[PDB]
Amino acid sequence: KEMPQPKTFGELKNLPLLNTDKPVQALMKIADELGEIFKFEAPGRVTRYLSSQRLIKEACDESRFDKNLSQALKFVRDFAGDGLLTSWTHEKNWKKAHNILLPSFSQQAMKGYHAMMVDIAVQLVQKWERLNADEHIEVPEDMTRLTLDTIGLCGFNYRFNSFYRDQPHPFITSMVRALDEAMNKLQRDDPAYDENKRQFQEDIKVMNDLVDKIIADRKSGEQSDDLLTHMLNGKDPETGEPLDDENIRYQIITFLIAGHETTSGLLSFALYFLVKNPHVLQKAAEEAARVLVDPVPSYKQVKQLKYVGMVLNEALRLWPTAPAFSLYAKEDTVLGGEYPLEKGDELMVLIPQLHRDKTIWGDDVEEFRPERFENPSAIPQHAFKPFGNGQRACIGQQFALHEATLVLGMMLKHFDFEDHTNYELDIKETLTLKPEGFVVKAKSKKIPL
Amino acid sequence: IKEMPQPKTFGELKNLPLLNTDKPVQALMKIADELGEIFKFEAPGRVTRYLSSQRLIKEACDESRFDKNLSQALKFVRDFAGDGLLTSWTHEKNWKKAHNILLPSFSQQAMKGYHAMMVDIAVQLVQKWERLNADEHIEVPEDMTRLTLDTIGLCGFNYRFNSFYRDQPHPFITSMVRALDEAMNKLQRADDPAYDENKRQFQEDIKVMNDLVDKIIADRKAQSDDLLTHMLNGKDPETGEPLDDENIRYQIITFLIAGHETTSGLLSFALYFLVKNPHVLQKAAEEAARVLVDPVPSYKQVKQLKYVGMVLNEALRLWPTAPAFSLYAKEDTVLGGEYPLEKGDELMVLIPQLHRDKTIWGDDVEEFRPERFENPSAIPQHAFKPFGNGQRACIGQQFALHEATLVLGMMLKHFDFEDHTNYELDIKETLTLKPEGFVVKAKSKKIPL
Numbered sequence: 085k086e087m088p089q090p091k092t093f094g095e096l097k098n099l100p101l102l103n104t105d106k107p108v109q110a111l112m113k114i115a116d117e118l119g120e121i122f123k124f125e126a127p128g129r130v131t132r133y134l135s136s137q138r139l140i141k142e143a144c145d146e147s148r149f150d151k152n153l154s155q156a157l158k159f160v161r162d163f164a165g166d167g168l169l170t171s172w173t174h175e176k177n178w179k180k181a182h183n184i185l186l187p188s189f190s191q192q193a194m195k196g197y198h199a200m201m202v203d204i205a206v207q208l209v210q211k212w213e214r215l216n217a218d219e220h221i222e223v224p225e226d227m228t229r230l231t232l233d234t235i236g237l238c239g240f241n242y243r244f245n246s247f248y249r250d251q252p253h254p255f256i257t258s259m260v261r262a263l264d265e266a267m268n269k270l271q272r273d274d275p276a277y278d279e280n281k282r283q284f285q286e287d288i289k290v291m292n293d294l295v296d297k298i299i300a301d302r303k304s305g306e307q308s309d310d311l312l313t314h315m316l317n318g319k320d321p322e323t324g325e326p327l328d329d330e331n332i333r334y335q336i337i338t339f340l341i342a343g344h345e346t347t348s349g350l351l352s353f354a355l356y357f358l359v360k361n362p363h364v365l366q367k368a369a370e371e372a373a374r375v376l377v378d379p380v381p382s383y384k385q386v387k388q389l390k391y392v393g394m395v396l397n398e399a400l401r402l403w404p405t406a407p408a409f410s411l412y413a414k415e416d417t418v419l420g421g422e423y424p425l426e427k428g429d430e431l432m433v434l435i436p437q438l439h440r441d442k443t444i445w446g447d448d449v450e451e452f453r454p455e456r457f458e459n460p461s462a463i464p465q466h467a468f469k470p471f472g473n474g475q476r477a478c479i480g481q482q483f484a485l486h487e488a489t490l491v492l493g494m495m496l497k498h499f500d501f502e503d504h505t506n507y508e509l510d511i512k513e514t515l516t517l518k519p520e521g522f523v524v525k526a527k528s529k530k531i532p533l
Numbered sequence: 534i535k536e537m538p539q540p541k542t543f544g545e546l547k548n549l550p551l552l553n554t555d556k557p558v559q560a561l562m563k564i565a566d567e568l569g570e571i572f573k574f575e576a577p578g579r580v581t582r583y584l585s586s587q588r589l590i591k592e593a594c595d596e597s598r599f600d601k602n603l604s605q606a607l608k609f610v611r612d613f614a615g616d617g618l619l620t621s622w623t624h625e626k627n628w629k630k631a632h633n634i635l636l637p638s639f640s641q642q643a644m645k646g647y648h649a650m651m652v653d654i655a656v657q658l659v660q661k662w663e664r665l666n667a668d669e670h671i672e673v674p675e676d677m678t679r680l681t682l683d684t685i686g687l688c689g690f691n692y693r694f695n696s697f698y699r700d701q702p703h704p705f706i707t708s709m710v711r712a713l714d715e716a717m718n719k720l721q722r723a724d725d726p727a728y729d730e731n732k733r734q735f736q737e738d739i740k741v742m743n744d745l746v747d748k749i750i751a752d753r754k755a756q757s758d759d760l761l762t763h764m765l766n767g768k769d770p771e772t773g774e775p776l777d778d779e780n781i782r783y784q785i786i787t788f789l790i791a792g793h794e795t796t797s798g799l800l801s802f803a804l805y806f807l808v809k810n811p812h813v814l815q816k817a818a819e820e821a822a823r824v825l826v827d828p829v830p831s832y833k834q835v836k837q838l839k840y841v842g843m844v845l846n847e848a849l850r851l852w853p854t855a856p857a858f859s860l861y862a863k864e865d866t867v868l869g870g871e872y873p874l875e876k877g878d879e880l881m882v883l884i885p886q887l888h889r890d891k892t893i894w895g896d897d898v899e900e901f902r903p904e905r906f907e908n909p910s911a912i913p914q915h916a917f918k919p920f921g922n923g924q925r926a927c928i929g930q931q932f933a934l935h936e937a938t939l940v941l942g943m944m945l946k947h948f949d950f951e952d953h954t955n956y957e958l959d960i961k962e963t964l965t966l967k968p969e970g971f972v973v974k975a976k977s978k979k980i981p982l
């Protein structure tokens with residue numbers, strides 16, 4: 085009944101606890117001490133952090149709780165607008181865009197995106213085959229090059245050409261800088277931040293201008309197998325209305341934000357766990373070698389990379405790269421039979437803690453064991469939520485998994501990998517998670533493309 | 534590409550008389566020793582191929598290319614098991630329905646609720662052995678069948694077969710074992726030479742089985758947390774429908790068939806290998822004593838019997854008590870790059886031969902070494918298949934291992950064992966395998982319950 089709460093800082097309450105450069109990891113350690121639920125207070129804010137499957141299975145009841153915009157999502161809303169990620173469920177553009185865009189994200193739609201994903205994956209492989217001896221790979225940097233180009237090409241037929249660059253593209257310099265200012269507002273109205281505010285607005289213009297220009301450019305009349313084409317021609321069956329031009333821009337910005345970082349973190353964590361668990365890497369490499377029998381993987385071959393998928397899911401279990409989502413109570417209700425909640429009360433789902441629920445997973449929760457995911461139907465309901473929940477779950481889940489399976493499968497086919505530094509896991513936190521400074525050496529197996 | 538070997542033939546009867554033997558699996562293993570990883574086996578009206586190498590079976594386990602087939606054995610068991618989970622085709626609507634409804638009651642989390650009833654039966658077996666007089670011996674498979682049959686009755690539908698109060702088995706299982714015996718006999722009949730007595734007996738055997746079950750279902754409908762309760766109150770999330778009363782009785786018969794025989798064979802082979810390998814017995818007894826520190830084991834203590842679990846996995850490697858399953862090709866495909874298969878072509882997986890693949894386990898394949906299973910990541914994919922494959926794998930796997938671990942643990946804690954007759958392994962073959970005539974002496978350690 086009485087809810088635990090971590091240490092306070094006077095009038096700032098719990099907020100200075102987030103004034104740290106690893107806040108998710110700080111929140112995990114608080115859950116380790118306090119258990120399945122703790123109250124987290126800030127000036128003007130009250131929420132509760134959930135960590136057990138028993139409580140989260142209830143928070144996930146869509147009849148009782150809806151998606152809430154966390155403070156992080158409200159700041160991203162300043163440039164993602166009413167895109168799909170940062171809109172409320174009752175907002176008319178959510179359901180409209182949801183109905184128009186769901187078909188472009190089905191497993192059936194990945195048959196059309198596959199060729200462009202292979203385009204960028206081949207560039208990654210060729211980059212690595214062209215390294216000189218004893219040169220190394222900066223893994224998260226190269227996975228980010230791959231994911232951003234993949235979504236740019238598949239989403240709106242745009243080539244960021246990240247593998248031709250050292251300093252990232254100007255659009256993503258401002259975009260990453262906007263996301264960086266959003267996270268900083270969390271752990272902060274002084275005049276010293278006025279520079280950041282003026283810089284934030286100029287970053288929004290850089291983003292809107294490039295995107296709004298592409299929308300105007302295409303509207304040429306050309307038709308391509310990309311999200312942008314479906315967004316100019318699609319009509320919501322419900323209202324019979326197409327998305328208006330402002331909403332298309334928000335979706336494009338949204339897909340770029342939601343696209344690259346979460347997926348590049350997954351690939352980066354997957355490769356870290358492979359080089360730290362050589363038996364698992366051997367099993368994944370044997371699968372890649374025997375399934376990917378052509379110089380260019382096909383869509384069907386990728387679907388046969390079952391163990392590669394298990395590696396991906398277990399990497400998502402330990403470090404889900406979009407590590408929380410937020411909910412509010414639609415009506416007065418009782419949580420777990422012990423925590424009465426009022427209408428509008430907020431919950432945070434701490435995904436990495438959920439995924440360490442010993443009562444669900446047994447006691448070896450910290451060990452990387454893809455064999456946990458041999459039979460996916462066996463996993464209890466709402467114990468594994470890397471892609472969120474319900475109708476507000478990740479619309480790009482199939483896209484992200486198909487890209488990551490394809491790319492990891494090709495990496496494992498084409499190179500042997502060496503953890504030549506004995507890399508010490510160091511998780512850098514933005515709004516997403518990635519293993520900072522992770523480096524490897526790749527020895528080519530000299531298989532042609 | 535490669536011409537497939539085939540064992541000796543008998544004119545128009547082809548290979549079928551090779552199965553007219555009282556140890557057909559063992560005969561099939563010796564054929565595999567002579568012919569290798571794959572051989573064609575022909576019968577009047579039937580063609581199948583027996584696989585014995587991990588290299589071919591890892592492709593056969595690809596669910597996009599092969600689905601579960603009903604062997605001739607399972608087609609005959611279907612005459613009284615109906616469309617229960619074990620003898621239904623994957624495309625049958627009652628398979629997926631019953632599968633979705635019954636998975637939560639077979640989860641590792643559900644074993645916490647069965648545990649008390651499992652201990653109930655384990656204590657009965659322990660007390661039987663401590664009440665033996667000096668120089669009396671234990672009939673091991675007989676007592677393990679008493680235990681597993683009572684555990685599935687109690688945990689499954691709150692019915693007490695009271696096997697430890699009986700000399701002659703329960704009337705329901707008299708026909709149940711006699712129906713299984715007729716099913717196996719139909720396999721090895723070179724027929725219709727006035728077999729009507731067997732036919733008339735088969736029908737009366739079915740009637741005994743349905744009547745007892747149909748009454749238990751009728752009795753209950755006029756709450757106990759058992760499989761029967763979940764089956765009356767469970768609704769499939771997909772179709773939203775519950776199981777009908779006909780299918781419920783097929784499931785009950787199926788669990789009684791599939792429950793006890795395979796699991797009692799496992800405990801029996803496990804104890805045989807333990808008394809034939811005294812260092813392994815000692816090591817498992819030492820684990821039992823330091824883990825089982827209470828007079829009654831808890832669910833958590835059973836999960837800590839790690840070496841006992843490896844002992845069970847190693848007995849399952851040498852003598853998997855459900856020794857084959859059947860698959861069919863969903864589409865034309867090539868097996869191993871050298872054996873073209875047409876859509877609908879059948880495969881048999883000879884599990885005990887698979888588990889003797891020297892390229893997987895080394896050259897000492899015949900030695901009992903539980904340490905092979907310290908890390909599941911070290912085992913190549915699909916090398917170890919005692920519970921079948923994929924979505925048609927054994928649903929009762931966690932039930933069987935928890936029961937067998939609890940019971941073996943209590944056995945090792947409470948008694949020292951003597952292989953007083955220097956027992957010579959003699960494997961009796963039904964549809965399952967057991968060590969016939971296996972007897973031991975147990976000297977009590979005098980630790981109270």
Ligand code: HEM
Pocket residue numbers: 151168169170182235338339342343344346347350400404405406408409410470471472473475476477478479480481483484
């Ligand atoms: C290119 C890949 C991806 C795209 C295009 C994408 C896009 C999106 C979009 C549009 C939403 C909002 C959906 C809605 O509310 O209607 C969303 C939600 C979400 N996504 Fe993704 N996503 C991608 C990859 C990923 C990855 C790899 C992960 C995690 C490992 C992830 C985790 C999530 C989560 C947890 C949510 C729910 C957030 C919340 O409830 O507030 N996404 N995604």
Ligand code: HEM
Pocket residue numbers: 601618619632685787788791792793795796799849853854855857858859919920921922924925926927928929930932933
């Ligand atoms: C109380 C214990 C057990 C129960 C309740 C049980 C039940 C079942 C059921 C219902 C199925 C069919 C699943 C489906 O197709 O949806 C099945 C399959 C299977 N079981 Fe079990 N079982 C038990 C113990 C065992 C043991 C101890 C073994 C072997 C050591 C075993 C080996 C197998 C195999 C090999 C299959 C797949 C058969 C095939 O593919 O044709 N089971 N079991």
Ligand SMILES: O=C(CCCCCn1ccnc1)N[C@@H](Cc1ccccc1)C(=O)O
Pocket residue numbers: 102124126129131154155156157270342406407408409432515516
């Ligand atoms: O916990 C989090 C982390 C969630 C980040 C997820 C953003 N994402 C998801 C998918 N792609 C991006 N955010 C809280 C922190 C906070 C709590 C109380 C008071 C102020 C801030 C919030 O924003 O409310």
Ligand SMILES: O=C(CCCCCn1ccnc1)N[C@@H](Cc1ccccc1)C(=O)O
Pocket residue numbers: 552574576579581603604605606607720855856857858859881964965
């Ligand atoms: O190989 C086997 C042994 C497998 C029995 C499995 C029994 N079990 C499995 C799970 N629970 C019970 N059975 C073949 C024999 C046969 C082959 C060719 C032609 C005729 C007969 C079959 O009947 O299909």
Ligand SMILES: C=Cc1ccccc1
Pocket residue numbers: 556559560563
């Ligand atoms: C007597 C042992 C035996 C071994 C293999 C096949 C049939 C019988």
Ligand SMILES: C=Cc1ccccc1
Pocket residue numbers: 623624629924
């Ligand atoms: C939806 C059909 C189906 C296919 C395979 C397994 C279970 C159900």
Ligand SMILES: C=Cc1ccccc1
Pocket residue numbers: 674675676678679682695696697699700701702703
């Ligand atoms: C050995 C099987 C058995 C089962 C119940 C009672 C007596 C014997």
Ligand SMILES: C=Cc1ccccc1
Pocket residue numbers: 893894904905906911912913
């Ligand atoms: C340690 C024994 C072993 C077990 C399985 C695969 C390789 C080695």
